[PDB]
Design a protein around this ligand. Structure first.
Ligand SMILES: CC(C)(COP(=O)(O)OP(=O)(O)OC[C@H]1O[C@@H](n2cnc3c(N)ncnc32)[C@H](O)[C@@H]1OP(=O)(O)O)[C@@H](O)C(=O)NCCC(=O)NCCS
Ligand SMILES: CC(C)(COP(=O)(O)OP(=O)(O)OC[C@H]1O[C@@H](n2cnc3c(N)ncnc32)[C@H](O)[C@@H]1OP(=O)(O)O)[C@@H](O)C(=O)NCCC(=O)NCCS
Ligand SMILES: CC(C)(COP(=O)(O)OP(=O)(O)OC[C@H]1O[C@@H](n2cnc3c(N)ncnc32)[C@H](O)[C@@H]1OP(=O)(O)O)[C@@H](O)C(=O)NCCC(=O)NCCS
Ligand SMILES: CC(C)(COP(=O)(O)OP(=O)(O)OC[C@H]1O[C@@H](n2cnc3c(N)ncnc32)[C@H](O)[C@@H]1OP(=O)(O)O)[C@@H](O)C(=O)NCCC(=O)NCCS
Lengths: 393, 393, 393, 393
């Protein structure tokens, strides 16, 4: 295991709906809210920060190296280096494990990690404006599809990759809608019971102060879902009611060496034990969590049943159900407060977001299980990434 | 310092000029050429590759997670994961150190690292086409400037940060042009004497085979540079003649553990010793190599004089002269075959590119210096990154 | 004056607001509605139609020669020719006089005239996409401003030409708002009392049937207008409240020789007597009706006092008040049911639209004035055009 | 016949190739060259001008009412009114007959008529930038096709309408290429013999002075043409060698009443006798000249064989051959100096251009035929327009 890496804080913005409450807010701006919050919760002096690593997928028109922009505007000294990564939906979680690597090697004693995404403000592009089209029409490309949600390999939406999982693996419409229903009910109940209150950092729009995850649909019913029309294929199983949302949010965590945390008198929340990534066939990219988790299990000597709580992102109900079946997930310990379907899925953010939700869930009074947590998600182009943690108490 | 990381191969495409010989080729296409070449030169079985990490800055419209596209189309199994990283001009060098970190930690035994950029095919963006402009003009933004060459913090060009270095630190027009002149002459001579022949991997365009760096200008004279008008400020010192080019290329290296290389019968070319990044004031971003190298020296106990050869990227002569002065570079051992001014500067590629040139330079018959190599470059937003190598012989 | 030209029918669509009830409908679609209605009201056999002339300003992206599209989709034989005409806000009125000229000369016995505009669907233009921008930002131009509402000569808005009239000729903010207020009240009352019912041709949207002018604001008060901020200049007088609307509509009339009407058994509604256009200084374009009407008076021997009703388009209250003062209008006989401020101003349509409103107004039971009608409007680039009619009874 | 209308002067710019010699010159700017020249050749005092009427097809991004822009910048007083028309390729010739109508009715004693077109600078548009695309791609529309060269009715290029003429009417490839060959040879010989010298007005590009029609191909051969690949349909007959060019030019004529010309001591060049337009099936829009000419013949009592010279625009060789066959054209009197194929076809200009070429041809010493001239062209959407003249001597 990594032996020297702890999480000392975490924070996420509310999750906005597509063209919703954060439509007038950049990914950088959401990123700043989250990082400022993470720094304050850790009580880390900003001159102890060694690096900032942020996932961000849809970067067109956002300006230079968005991680660096966020850092400079969260009160982090200009002397601290920063870079941005893209592993699509894996981005925010691979940012965390890259940061953990920095600390475990002794290249850093404190790293800010996270992810951000404003899918609302992914722009449109034209490919041939530099040297000209000469004659004939061109395409006005939605970068959220071109550079995000469309499989570059196959030329179809991620939602078709979900239908592939449905076809090949026999995940029925009823199963998908059941998963979707449970996710909404869980998210609604969690919200109403204050389960998200502490982890959320409010976003002030200069004024309106946004505190609530706006994508949850508490009025969701099994019958309502069954009426919906397929979204990606005619006579399909995947709908808008059982696919993840398109959303806007950011999320950040402060990582530290054990020795640095001790020196600053900062209480460690959790250790990071290890991480893994793995590739799969792009056409069934939803399966990525399965080899990613297996690899993580071989590196750590853990098994699925050892985890007290598990976050496996719901990109599509077809995907989430298949992953949970094959890994032998306990659904009473997996995605307990909803996930991508209910809360939403801002793609560069979600990897750090699910780790943040896991951490706060496991930190709650009365959690006296194994104290191990697992986070994993699927990734367009056919990948998965995962991280194991153990709470410190 | 790192004890277990070796470079076993390196390759780069030739470097195209802006809107030049690679205008019809994508970043991803160049990446594939470089990665295939690196793999062939290593003789590494593709099922021994653990991860791919590629730097790439101007990603708008290029499709999903371009490192993954490159891997899949270079014959690497779908099971291998990949991610893309943006540290502007640092990207390709930071990709190398991130990959080294994988191996040093034992998370991987073989990683593909590098970078790629097609500045020619960076698209134009429309910011408010999703929810509408309503009334009134918008901006058609050139992503190469918005997301690349314009300082998001100051809102002026990288060239103006070059002027700032000239203002504050008194690097004169004449000094800038001498540097530029020597760069052009060094590159011309190197290209004529065959110095780049082995490192270059030819690009086939469907048939034309491209084998040569396009951007070098052997006709350059001190008297010609002196007549050029300032490109960034009225009555300025920075000109198209003493500024790096805008360019297209890709570059890749194969890294391995010493153990895996020994297992496979593959001979190491160089050890990676260590790395360092650092931040500076965005307005004088060109100063970034100075703290990055000092931090690297502090981590390794090396000094500038210990290097046999040095690659410090010439983003602008003003910047390069200042860094070399401040670091006490021996110009007979620094940038001996030219650099960004002459060879060109495809921003996401250059960090790996300079390391490949350094490696092949030090590997020439007749070299018998320290066998230590230094690569560093400056970064928009005020950063530097650096790597130290030692040839294996 | 003309001795052989009669109007036998007229129809207009309701007038939509900007991005309003007709946002999903093309100019051509509205044109078809109006032309079909006009043809049905005339009872003219379509094989008796000799030509179609339609005004239309913002034609970008609408396809080929839109008058011809309208004719073909209104059931007019392919054998009938058509052309489109642009005199900005004059277009639809100049279309009428051009058609009258056909008949007076004996080149035609029956012509379809009118105008159409969908300011909502005027597109955005990219100027250098054919041969390339090469490097550097461009402009995404709103064609409604570029090709419509911005003075190409001065490079400022039509609203600023309105300010110029206020500066030079001292039409005060209070005067502007009184005009605007009376316009809104006149239109509200007219619409409520059924005045527009017969002239309007309903628009079916595939089902929604649209029958009502959208833009009127019956809640307008002198006190409300007085609180509005200037829309075109800092510390100006012209506001969104005392300025014409941006709007969508179409309007058509059927013109015939007296001989053909008598042959077909079709009863004439009005004679067209004559027409006139004139130019003025672009910077005070709102003054255009003054020389156009004087030239018309000179050609006809009529005077302002001889008209029973007058339509002088309210492009801006500043402009309308100045014209009415200079021409000695009787405001109890001028714009009696509102005009551009209240009903709205779809620029290529309005010239025909005001003539249709004038015609139906004078045709009301109980009218027993001179039976002479005057229509005129101002034109960007510094023009006016006018038509005089006399009802047949 | 019209009895009171004469042409007192004419002028045209050279005709530029697509993205050629006038690529950096607007339609307005070419228009100004032509109008200034026409005014000077007439020696008409500018305060005797009553109206300006200019054809112009592709008006996107050109600014307000381009006829008015041209007038103001050709030294015509601001008091003179102007409008722009669009009848696609008919535009420039219908402008002439509309102007003649103004004079014959006694509404004007002097009118400037013409046409202009910069097909090079027709821009690209996006249809849904005002209210947004929300999600998914859009189209970047080439307005030269959308609003120009594509049949809006059928959704295919004008070149397909030419293939329709070829299919239905049996105009072979060999016939088309023969027509094309003859057109090039005629144009080359005419140019080389100075036949275009007087009519051309030189265009100074601020410096290079352009005097030559640049589209002519004197190296054209029957064999060369036979090698060319179809341009519009697979296994088609229509090629780039036998279709009109895409081009840039302008052209203007001064018209006057007989009485006004006498008063000013301006010698009339030709009388305009009459005009006609007619519609046809859009799919065979090339046939438009046939009914247009027939109608003109019935109005005038002229027959085809009465014309000393004839201009029938070559939009496509298939079109021109069919029109000439059906009208019984003498090819030794028809298109004697080439036409659309050789000289080019700037669409809003060509209608006035062919009348200008006709007028100068008939004015040459040694032309002592009937003194009657005919001009006619086809029009997308299925129309034709024609004008008859008689030289005065
Ligand atoms: C599926 C998708 C295309 C739908 O997007 P959308 O149409 O913008 O979605 P909306 O939230 O507006 O919902 C669409 C409709 O579905 C219905 N709907 C959605 N969720 C529902 C629910 N829980 N119950 C009932 N109806 C529901 C609604 O009727 C809604 O229309 P309405 O609210 O205007 O009446 C989009 O969410 C998507 O692509 N998701 C996947 C994202 C993804 O691939 N991420 C990466 C994965 S690795
Ligand atoms: C400086 C810059 C704007 C020049 O762009 P450009 O104008 O397209 O450059 P070109 O190579 O076409 O040079 C323009 C002219 O300069 C002249 N020129 C350039 N190098 C010359 C040399 N060595 N000798 C003589 N003249 C030279 C030429 O006249 C050339 O015109 P040409 O086409 O007739 O040869 C651009 O190179 C730039 O922005 N560079 C910096 C990139 C950067 O910031 N990277 C990131 C660093 S962190
Ligand atoms: C003036 C102009 C810029 C206003 O455009 P806009 O801002 O889209 O106009 P809106 O109708 O949305 O008005 C903006 C605000 O003004 C206020 N307003 C407008 N008319 C009002 C009235 N009668 N009473 C009170 N408030 C009024 C409202 O607050 C409105 O906001 P809302 O949406 O909450 O009602 C535009 O109408 C214009 O350019 N007009 C002139 C067109 C022209 O030049 N034509 C050619 C003439 S030759
Ligand atoms: C047919 C059309 C699409 C071709 O446009 P284009 O490809 O840009 O044309 P070019 O002038 O570049 O010629 C294309 C190729 O044809 C060949 N060519 C053209 N004319 C030739 C000739 N006379 N002899 C030999 N080769 C010829 C050339 O090889 C040329 O390629 P190259 O010169 O680079 O070797 C275009 O001219 C067109 O659409 N014309 C019709 C316009 C129209 O419809 N107007 C309205 C009518 S109502």
């Amino acid at each position: 295991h990594m032996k020297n890496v702890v999480i000392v804080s975490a924070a996420r913005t509310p999750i906005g709906s597509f063209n919703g409450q954060f439509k007038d807010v950049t990914a950088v701006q959401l990123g700043i809210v989250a990082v400022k919050a993470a720094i304050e919760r850790a009580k880390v002096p900003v001159d102890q920060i060694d690096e900032v690593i942020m996932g961000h997928v849809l970067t067109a028109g956002c300006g230079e190296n968005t991680a660096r922009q966020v850092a400079l505007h969260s009160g982090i000294p200009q002397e601290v280096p920063a870079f941005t990564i893209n592993k699509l939906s894996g981005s925010g979680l691979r940012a965390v494990s890259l940061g953990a690597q920095q600390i475990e090697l002794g290249d850093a004693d404190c790293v800010i990690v996270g992810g951000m995404e404003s899918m609302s403000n992914a722009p449109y592009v034209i490919a041939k404006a530099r040297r000209g089209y000469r004659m004939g029409n061109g395409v006005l490309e939605d970068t959220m599809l071109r550079d995000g949600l469309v499989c570059t390999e196959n030329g179809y939406h991620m939602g078709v990759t979900a239908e592939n999982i449905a076809s090949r693996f026999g995940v029925t419409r009823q199963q998908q809608d059941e998963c979707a229903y449970n996710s909404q009910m869980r998210a609604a109940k969690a919200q109403a019971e204050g389960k998200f209150d502490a982890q959320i950092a409010p976003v002030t729009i200069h004024d309106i102060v946004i505190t609530k995850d706006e994508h949850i649909r508490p009025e969701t019913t099994l019958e309502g879902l069954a009426k919906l029309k397929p979204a990606f294929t005619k006579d399909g199983t995947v709908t808008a009611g059982n696919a993840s949302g398109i959303n806007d949010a950011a999320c950040a965590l402060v990582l530290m060496s054990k020795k640095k945390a001790e020196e600053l008198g900062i209480k460690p929340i959790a250790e990071i034990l290890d991480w893994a990534s793995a590739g799969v066939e792009p056409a069934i990219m939803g399966t990525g969590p399965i080899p990613a988790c297996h690899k993580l299990f071989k590196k750590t000597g853990l098994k699925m049943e050892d985890f007290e709580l598990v976050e496996l992102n719901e990109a599509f109900a077809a995907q989430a159900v298949y992953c949970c079946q094959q890994l032998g997930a306990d659904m009473s310990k997996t995605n307990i407060y909803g996930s991508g379907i209910s809360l939403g899925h801002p793609v560069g953010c979600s990897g750090a977001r699910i780790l943040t939700t896991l951490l706060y869930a496991l930190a709650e009074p009365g959690r006296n299980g194994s104290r191990y947590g697992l986070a994993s998600l699927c990734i367009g182009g056919g990948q998965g990434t995962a991280v194991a943690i153990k709470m410190c108490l």
